[PDB]
């Protein structure tokens, strides 16, 4: 019980850190996409 419980605590910690890291990566991808979309729309308007 002690072995599986602290391994499950480690599993919970790794799940949390993986979730937050993936969320940070997704947020960076999303805001980079937003900024690129804004500049691309600016350039599209300039081209038009």
């Amino acid at each position: 019980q002690k072995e599986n419980e602290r391994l499950l605590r480690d599993w919970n910690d790794v799940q949390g850190r993986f979730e937050k890291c993936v969320s940070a990566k997704e947020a960076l991808e999303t805001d980079l996409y937003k900024r690129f979309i804004l500049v691309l729309n600016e350039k599209k308007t300039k081209i038009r």
Partner: protein, 258 residues
Amino acid sequence: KISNIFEDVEFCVMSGTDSQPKPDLENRIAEFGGYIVQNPGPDTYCVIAGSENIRVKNIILSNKHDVVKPAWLLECFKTKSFVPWQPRFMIHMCPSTKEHFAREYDCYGDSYFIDTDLNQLKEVFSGIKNSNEQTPEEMASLIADLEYRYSWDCSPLSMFRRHTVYLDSYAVINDLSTKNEGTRLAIKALELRFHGAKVVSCLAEGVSHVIIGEDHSRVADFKAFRRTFKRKFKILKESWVTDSIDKCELQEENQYLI
């Protein structure tokens, strides 16, 4: 004295102490032959100031000249020559200069003569405020359309944007008295969201795929729904999703043949 090009041009260096003392700036511009006037006049090509005063605010109101940062002066010093004006120094700028910029520059820091490197593009993006104005569905759809228009969806890390795979992690519908603790459904959700796919728990008309867990002994309902539903679903083996971890590689189109 050194750069005579700054002669015949008036410079209203009426402030500037945070970076360098104003007398030092005056001495340097005199060494470059800049006209040091203590107050703006309708012959000064640009007004130079540091901290922003009521005089600068009035010039903003009474649009007479441009409030150029001392950093542009530092750029001129390090270049030892004239530095073209960029839309990052002038806090306030005359409408004529606004038209001049708009005629040959974008509304942002991007310029047609000086390209922006990684750091410059990062600064341009950061200067543009970031907020939420587009819905996630619309923004994802536009991203997918632009990526398909120029073949950007072929990135090996994000291919599940279009494939909204539904994971039937719930045996029953609308029952909050149960919670699957210690299950690998969270692992499957993380794997799906790694490539960009987002799972949904509410059934709607936008879901075009139904995927059940390891309990594949439910072929009877699939068989019954094949005759009923015209939307012929596609179900692959569970080894394919594990290939994203073991092989960690995409599957080529040559596998889809006769």
